[PDB]
């Protein structure tokens, strides 16, 4: 019969996306911030979220914040090369000392713009998973996930110390301005199990909530 085709396609045209495992990898790709210009980003893929494998956690060279990014889907992302990357292990100087910062409150020194001494209380959550001489750390009055070489910090005296599940679950946040923002819980902290990571659809930050 001689009709107009309508949702025409073909099964051949239909390749998988996110085939190759890029965990551990070093990546460059482009970034089109709105109508803005196409800058290049380089970084290191730390994890791939088990309960949403569209989602990668990237550490970008010289951004302190960990980024959750849906690397294949996201259309601000272009030209995604996986660099080959080295036979440089970087092992850890003192792992008795590193293994007793997991879990601890800490006080972390930051310069202000004038070069004056600011200290921010945080918590150290875990050692980062690919670059395992960095730590996941979150802060009390910035509760998103950050990454630093907290030994280097301790070493130069810039850091001090003192004494089932719902992973998968979609969640929304109740703004006092009426709207909602939908995300999902993506990780549970092995050290402080009352602590989880949320990732909201409209933002690349991983947020750390204590949910008990």
């Amino acid at each position: 019969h001689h009709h107009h085709h309508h949702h025409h396609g073909s099964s051949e045209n239909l390749y998988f996306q996110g085939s190759r495992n890029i965990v551990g990898c070093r990546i460059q790709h482009g970034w089109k911030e709105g109508n803005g210009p196409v800058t290049q980003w380089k970084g290191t893929v730390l994890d791939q979220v088990p309960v949403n494998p569209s989602l990668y956690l990237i550490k970008y060279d010289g951004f302190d914040c960990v980024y959750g990014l849906e690397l294949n889907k996201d259309e601000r992302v272009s030209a995604l090369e996986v660099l080959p990357d080295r036979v440089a292990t970087s092992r850890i100087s003192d792992a008795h000392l590193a293994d007793t910062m997991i879990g601890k409150a800490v006080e972390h020194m930051f310069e202000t713009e004038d070069g004056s001494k600011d200290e921010w209380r945080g918590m150290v959550l875990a050692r980062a998973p690919v670059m395992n001489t960095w730590f996941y750390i979150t802060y009390e009055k910035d509760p998103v996930l950050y990454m630093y070489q907290l030994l280097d910090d301790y070493k130069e005296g810039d850091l001090r110390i003192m004494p089932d599940s719902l992973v998968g679950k979609q969640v929304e946040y109740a703004k006092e301005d009426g709207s909602k923002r939908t995300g999902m819980v993506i990780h549970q902290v092995e050290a402080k199990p009352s602590v989880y990571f949320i990732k909201f659809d409209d933002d690349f930050h991983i947020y750390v909530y204590d949910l008990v």
Partner: peptide
């Protein structure tokens, strides 16, 4: 010696 953004 860390700058806040």
């Amino acid at each position: 010696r860390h700058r806040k953004v």
